[PDB]
Subunit: 219 residues, 6 copies
């Protein structure tokens, strides 16, 4: 990663063994459950493109997912290059070449060029741009590896309301879109797919009931 | 988090893999037992709103509770917005715009703006405001997910007094101000002791410490 | 905690995850065995009142003991306030208000006021004063949760002398008073409650025998 | 390793016990699965040749592979020596002699000469040259120790498409440029799908993403 | 402990949770095997008397040994006091009073006075004096708690010579100067070998190394 | 160990608990397998003689090996003293006495004298000299505790060539001499002790076949 020293300079630091192990283990145990995204973002804080490639390369298995990840990165790299055409010309003494999509992804850039971009003034944060592409890709994998659709979450006749809301939002969280789309899913399904006893109780509460009030009413 | 370095400057640091793992593990093993609140507050020392969102997003399961958490944040955010009316105007070079409710929660603010506020002179502790909203929300979850009421905690005829007082205060801590929690001790606590110990505790008279009550019902 | 930076200034540091886990685990495994006191004192090195409250709040179970702890803190807080009456008046630019008992315990003080007291010149060590109250309380719990009295430690007819001295001093250590009181207990009971074979051997050694000599003589 | 301290100077540091243990454990559990290469590269960040030799020497077993590693280092070292003819002459007070192939591998160079080269102005990154030779050698071991060929990876008649693509790319990663690895996807991958999914994938037509192919053979 | 920081100043640091845990665990698993002494000396590097008392107080069980430890400290403390007669007089602003025996053990000295002595110019290493008394006491415990005498360690008729020499020196290390420990080797070691190996070792003659003796009784 | 601070000064640091545990555990699990040597060298990076004695003293068991280690150290100490006769005379204000063999081994030197030697300008690296003696001794133990001779490594009639080369070089690695002696062992035995099928294949390859080519030919 790139961290600040006590001189105020952004300097390269080696990825720690603890960081490597934490990412390998979380994929091993949690696969592509939705909480893999925040874990990857936090463990990759300040990462260079080399570090991000290191983390993803240490993943054993799920190679189908990892190949989908490269294809996502490619489309975003192609989009970056079409929005940022590089201008030919000698690079000045105190300057860095402009990065391509392949440079952000680390396939045509050295770690020293990545450090130069990320510690420039102003910085060009190729690590954070790459991370955005990867997380975009990981969001697709989470949505694809989600077993259940939101339309199949129906409260059982003896199922506690808390367990049903647990399943509802767990399923909704794996299908990542905008929250405009997830507020619409709740208003459409959460009360309507409650069991007949709890459904009649919540209809009387009205659309303005908070979830805390809804969960108290079907206790 | 934003911590002070070895020279006296407030700097951003990445959340450590140990901090991430410790919070995930505590929710896994302890759910929303009352001791989850101090663990979250301590593990989030100096956290930015991004860090707090990271910690909350790494929680697997309990998505109904986490959704109640979201609803609580909204009410407090709306209260914050109603107490801090917006002032339109260009933000000056040196200073920073005033944060809205959605900015404290980190949903409409970048990490650099959160760092900018916290290292301002004087600091606007958006991380601590967000943390307070979260703990307010987590406190509600502990109360809702508490299985037993304090009025149902009563000492068995052969149960040692220590075990009953253990159950009593464990339940009371889950049942959340001291206006009536102070009230449960010494008035409900004696009433639900078994007849053998209850007769002993009348003889002790008012003003007995819990150490005196526990000594008196040892045998 | 409050630690020194390289500038010579006492600055606040976040309580580490390792410190939190160590205290939670030691209570889990050792309950209120006497070695819980030194572990708590060492793990709370440099703690603020907030940190001390954090540690105690993370304890799961033993809520009867924890309530006895608050009552001890209250008496010591009441004693502090009666020995340190606060003098009303505006606090000067370069000064701190005088702390109440409730301020030392952290119920009416912010963490910033605790930092101000502890890093003042000269410092008013509210964290170390609070720690003294807590450890005073923990000493009472260890004495109360001790199963055996010193008068019941008698050497068995086939029990090795080392095992008996182990039990003797383990029991004596849980009943914490002054060592004047513990030297008196040894001179009163250690030889007199030895088995008849070892007792006659040690009587000949006389009162001036070291324990190493006593343990060698009954090998 | 040679890392930058908190002030901006490149200093030698001892390899940490965690780094040593992490590398030993990864070889123990993963042998020469493809993900061993990124783990070794990351754990050896900033390594001197002595550090790289330390890591390789701590490997227990797989001594045939480790001997193949030695032979690879020799060929690259001999290539290095053939591209860098020796210049005889007294080495000047300030500067350092040119490193031979055996010097990069650390067999004829002391640790202080390796530090001297790496902190030179400009640096001669002997640690990174050695690391590159090692990874070149480790890449050969992964290919030789890969049990299955990509031409033998074919989808079963009842095997889910995700599991087959998982096996496909796991094998391809073990079978080492993208000149023909790009070729295996989309041409060999469709051919070895089962007849049910194979018929579906013809209908998708050329240019289908892997996400589209995996969605189309879900059911 | 008192350690040197990154700038060259001797500063007090809190004993780490890992140091506390490591010492507790080593006593739990190894008791007073001889290797407990080096572990305690190394884990207490730079310790203050308070730190040494902390480590000793965290030991659970073995309270008879710990009491023998207390008696040893008293004898050495009394010897220290007899060699350092007290000088009455007001202590000067800059300097510190001379420490008594009870001050080195930390029972009548505060932690700040122990820090003051150790950072004095020249230092009075009260922590190292206390540590030496403790190790003197712990050495006695290892001898008393050693089950077997070196005179009872003899090679079996079918026991491999390596295993017998292993038992021999393990016992000798437990049986504590080299005045007669040097004596046990080469004179008692040959005498207690079995007749087959014993006959071989006479033929080797005086001056054989242990490597030569172990090679000669391999078969 | 002796590490560099940020002032550029070589200063003493306490041996870490992690370093102590790592060395104890690696001996426990791996005994004197050849990889114990690099682990000991890396874990003892920058060690003083006191630290090296600490590490070796923490080893439980294998006391026969540890006694052979002292005898090796003695011969090397005697050789050092006969090559470096000390010159009598008062030591100057800014100087250190010359170290004996017993001073390098730490039996007649204080830790402060070891720090003085190791941080002198120029340094006299008693820690690295001692380490050379210890590793010389550990090499002898590895050779002695090796069960199998290189002449007994013969490929089985159904044994895969990789497994045979594994055994061959594992055995050769435990008998440490020069690589001139180990190149001679390979050319003498590796092909000649292959099974008749693989032997005839490799004879046709000729003496110039790399191991990678040899292992491919007997797949
Ligand atoms: C990527 C990254 C940089 C980031 C970020 C990031 C940024 C902001 C916010 C956030 C914070 C507070 C509020 Cl009040 C809202 C809001 N208020 S709202 C009602 O929509 O209008 N919205 N947000 C997101 C916004 F603004 F982006 F929309 C938020 C989140 C929350 C964090 C959070 C998690 C939690 F458990 C409980 C909380 F109180 C807050 N995370 C999510 O909400 C994800 N989630 N999704 C759904 C579902 F789909 F089921 F509905 C569900 C969640 C859920 F909250 F977990 C919970 C079960 C429900 N994260 S990171 C740190 O991962 O690296
Ligand atoms: C989490 C966080 C945000 C914080 C904080 C926080 C802040 C202040 C205080 C506190 C300090 C001193 C006093 Cl004298 C009182 C007081 N005296 S009184 C008579 O009420 O007026 N009260 N308090 C709480 C105050 F201030 F909130 F009111 C306090 C606590 C105590 C600390 C504590 C914990 C403990 F285990 C044992 C102790 F001896 C002291 N913790 C609690 O009390 C929690 N608790 N709750 C209840 C219940 F409700 F069931 F009865 C019960 C407890 C209990 F004490 F454990 C015990 C069984 C009874 N913690 S943090 C720093 O980790 O981030
Ligand atoms: C003590 C210390 C300070 C050091 C060092 C140290 C210094 C240099 C080198 C080294 C590096 C590269 C080459 Cl190309 C040669 C070479 N080329 S060669 C063909 O001989 O001409 N030689 N060397 C040693 C030289 F120069 F000293 F001879 C080397 C080693 C190798 C490290 C290594 C290990 C490995 F697994 C694979 C590698 F690619 C490199 N370690 C050894 O080789 C030990 N070993 N022994 C034998 C056997 F006996 F079976 F043959 C075998 C090995 C083996 F390699 F493991 C492998 C199975 C074969 N270590 S430390 C770090 O431990 O603290
Ligand atoms: C180890 C180290 C030295 C390094 C590096 C390193 C360097 C660059 C790149 C890389 C980055 C971006 C793109 Cl867009 C491409 C590209 N796009 S493409 C169409 O080929 O032209 N290719 N690459 C590799 C390049 F550059 F080498 F060609 C890349 C990688 C990727 C990172 C990655 C890993 C991952 F898991 C999932 C991802 F989405 C991305 N890792 C690999 O690709 C390894 N891999 N191999 C094959 C195989 F051969 F089987 F098909 C397969 C992979 C796979 F991706 F995992 C996936 C199943 C397919 N890593 S390090 C920094 O740790 O020390
Ligand atoms: C709270 C805190 C800040 C502190 C401190 C603290 C301060 C000083 C001392 C101490 C040191 C040396 C001597 Cl010679 C005496 C002494 N000489 S004497 C004979 O009395 O005249 N006295 N002391 C205490 C003094 F001075 F306070 F009295 C001491 C202790 C000892 C530490 C110790 C433990 C140990 F195992 C072996 C040792 F050699 C020293 N701890 C105790 O002794 C507690 N203990 N109690 C009893 C019993 F009740 F059974 F008798 C028993 C012990 C016991 F020692 F463990 C052992 C089985 C016997 N600790 S902390 C670090 O916990 O956070
Ligand atoms: C704990 C601490 C305070 C310290 C220190 C400490 C200080 C010095 C020395 C030492 C160093 C060099 C020599 Cl050449 C001799 C010597 N040569 S000699 C012929 O006697 O004259 N003697 N010594 C001890 C000295 F100086 F004390 F005399 C030494 C040791 C050795 C180091 C060592 C350990 C080891 F495992 C293997 C080694 F090769 C060397 N450790 C011991 O010897 C302990 N030991 N005891 C006996 C017994 F009594 F059973 F025979 C036995 C050992 C043994 F060696 F292990 C082996 C089976 C025999 N350690 S610390 C720094 O951790 O805080
Ligand atoms: Cl780490
Ligand atoms: Cl790790
Ligand atoms: Cl996996
Ligand atoms: Cl890269
Ligand atoms: Cl790659
Ligand atoms: Cl893989
Ligand atoms: Cl960490
Ligand atoms: Cl971790
Ligand atoms: Cl955010
Ligand atoms: Cl989100
Ligand atoms: Cl989830
Ligand atoms: Cl404000
Ligand atoms: Cl930590
Ligand atoms: Cl932890
Ligand atoms: Cl518990
Ligand atoms: Cl507080
Ligand atoms: Cl509270
Ligand atoms: Cl509880
Ligand atoms: Cl470490
Ligand atoms: Cl480790
Ligand atoms: Cl080397
Ligand atoms: Cl070697
Ligand atoms: Cl091996
Ligand atoms: Cl070069
Ligand atoms: Cl720690
Ligand atoms: Cl720990
Ligand atoms: Cl003390
Ligand atoms: Cl005590
Ligand atoms: Cl005890
Ligand atoms: Cl002195
Ligand atoms: Cl450590
Ligand atoms: Cl450890
Ligand atoms: Cl062992
Ligand atoms: Cl020493
Ligand atoms: Cl010794
Ligand atoms: Cl031993």
């Amino acid at each position: 990663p790139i961290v600040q020293n006590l001189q105020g300079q952004m300097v390269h630091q080696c990825i720690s063994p603890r960081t490597l192990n934490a990412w390998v283990k979380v994929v091993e145990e949690k696969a592509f459950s939705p909480e893999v995204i925040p874990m990857f973002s936090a463990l990759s804080c300040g990462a260079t493109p080399q570090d991000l490639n290191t983390m993803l390369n240490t993943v054993g298995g799920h190679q189908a997912a990892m190949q989908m990840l490269k294809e996502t990165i490619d489309e975003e790299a192609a989009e970056w290059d079409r929005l940022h055409p590089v201008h030919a010309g000698p690079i000045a003494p105190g300057q860095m070449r402009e990065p391509r999509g392949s440079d952000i992804a680390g396939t045509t850039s050295t770690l020293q060029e990545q450090i130069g971009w990320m510690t420039h003034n102003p910085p060009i944060p190729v690590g954070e741009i790459y991370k955005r592409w990867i997380i975009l890709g990981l969001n697709k994998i989470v949505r694809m590896y989600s077993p259940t659709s939101i339309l199949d979450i129906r409260q059982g006749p003896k199922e506690p309301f808390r367990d049903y809301v647990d399943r509802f939002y767990k399923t909704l969280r794996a299908e990542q879109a905008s929250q405009e789309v997830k507020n619409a899913a709740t208003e459409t399904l959460l009360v309507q797919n409650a069991n007949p006893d709890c459904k009649t109780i919540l209809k009387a509460l009205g659309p303005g009931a908070t979830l805390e009030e809804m969960m108290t009413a079907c206790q």
